[PDB]
């Protein structure tokens, strides 16, 4: 009914939006290998009363036009895929990619999901899975029960210890994916990501070398939320969604006193 | 070159100690000034 | 609309910027060698209603008259140039201006900018530079490869010892410059001066002599902030700002009677 009614709904839409995005990263302040999201502000159309520019007289051009906006939006929510801290831990199945790369799992439809996360374990059958929903590991990590203990490499390269036996036992070798644009992965939840259109073609090598990052035995990726920004953000999100408030009010009462008088 | 030796770290405990209290110190008053700042913003929007 | 709508319109855009002028200060509390910021106000231009010292008749005057004020502003945020504190370094490439003067930089665009921060550090070519965006330091100081220290004398003559031989081989002279009025300089980020012309022809010379500072390594000179100062001008402020947003309340609230009366 109004343009400033209509403008400040998008501005309360897009408000809506960044709290939403800061209470998934406040939520996932503890999360293994979880990555933070900012959201991405654009202003909408300009509606076009006066062309800046418009000849307004021979030598003479309008140096600004009367250009009324359409509000704000949302138009991303850009994954940071900035490197976490590193948890020091006593378990030996757990795992961690010192710069860039991504754990890769099969998902039970048959394709392969890329992780962050480190946390692994073994199944009934001793593959080595997640430590969540228990998906196995590609490639597949199966440890004897000859075995003592299990050490995995920088380079990958999982070899096991077997009694009687002064000699490891290969038993895999772990491959990592790098991602040009790991932002453009599709997240879905479960620690897991899914390649897309804008994320490019999985580039799957041994963890260290050609851009690779490093397999770390015994240590866990953090998340890289922080708390402080997270909650200046809140705050400021919390005003400039009740700045349209106010906007939306005042139009509000306008509207009434025109019914009472006109 | 010597052998027999190893170089520990190069840090002094007192001096991070009194570094760490000044920087919660900053911290804290910067947090005060964005406070001040957010009570204003409250302020003008209880008209 | 209403002439109290207006004149506190400057009052909170005054304290606005002195806010904004103290949130700076406290930010570059741990900054080396920062010059705190004052802000000065005055009032603005007095509407003449009625002329003070006029004629009311022969014989007689109208004593004071009556003028309403248009607000305040802030005209300037004046640069307080006083020395910080000195603090003590292991590193020796580090200098401290014990007096009045500046150090100079060669900046990407030709032009010498000036520097009060003392932390410098090396380039690939063994030039000194700053440690931050890595601008050379006027004069080029090139530390030779053979050297197995540094030493900074009070006169800025910079010498090496080279192994195997005695006496300081002198590998440079710094110079430091000075100006009559260092509040007029322009500052442009990164801790850099460029001088104006209220700043004044720059001067320089040896340092140490002709009434510039000594330059004493392996030490820093801290902000000269006072966060009590700071603290105390941000209630102060906070409360002019809300008694100045309660006249427009009060006209705000005038105004809608009006409109119900009128």
Not at chain 1, 22 to 48: C, H, M, P
Not at chain 1, 173 to 196: A, K, R
């Amino acid at each position: 009914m109004h343009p400033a009614l209509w403008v400040s709904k998008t501005g309360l839409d897009a408000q809506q939006t960044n709290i939403a995005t800061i209470s998934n990263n406040l939520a996932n302040a503890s999360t293994v290998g979880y990555k933070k999201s900012r959201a991405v502000f654009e202003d909408l159309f300009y509606q076009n009363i006066n062309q800046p520019g418009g000849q307004s007289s021979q030598n003479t051009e309008l140096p600004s036009g009367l250009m009324l906006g359409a509000g704000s939006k949302v138009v991303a929510t850009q994954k940071v895929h900035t490197h976490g801290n590193a948890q020091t831990t006593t378990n030996a199945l757990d795992m961690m990619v010192e710069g860039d790369g991504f754990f890769q799992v099969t998902l039970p439809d048959g394709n392969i999901g890329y992780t962050r996360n480190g946390q692994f374990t073994l199944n009934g059958e001793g593959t080595l899975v997640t430590s969540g929903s228990g998906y196995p590991v590609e490639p597949e990590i199966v440890i004897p029960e000859d075995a003592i203990s299990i050490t995995v490499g920088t380079d990958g390269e999982v070899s096991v210890r077997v009694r009687g036996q002064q000699d490891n036992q290969v038993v895999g070798q772990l491959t990592i994916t790098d991602f040009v644009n790991p932002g453009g992965l599709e997240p879905i939840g479960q620690n897991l990501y899914l390649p897309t259109g804008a994320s490019g073609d999985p580039q799957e090598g041994v963890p260290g070398l050609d851009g690779l990052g490093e397999i770390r035995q015994s240590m866990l990726e953090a998340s890289n939320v922080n708390v402080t920004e997270e909650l200046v953000n809140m705050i400021e999100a919390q005003r400039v969604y009740e700045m349209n408030s106010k906007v939306i009010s005042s139009v509000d009462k306008m509207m009434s006193f025109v019914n009472q008088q006109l | 070159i010597n052998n027999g030796m190893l170089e520990q770290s190069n840090i002094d405990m007192t001096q991070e100690l009194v570094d760490l209290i000044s920087a919660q110190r900053n911290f804290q008053a910067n947090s005060r000034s964005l406070e001040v700042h957010n009570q204003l913003q409250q302020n003008i929007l209880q008209i």
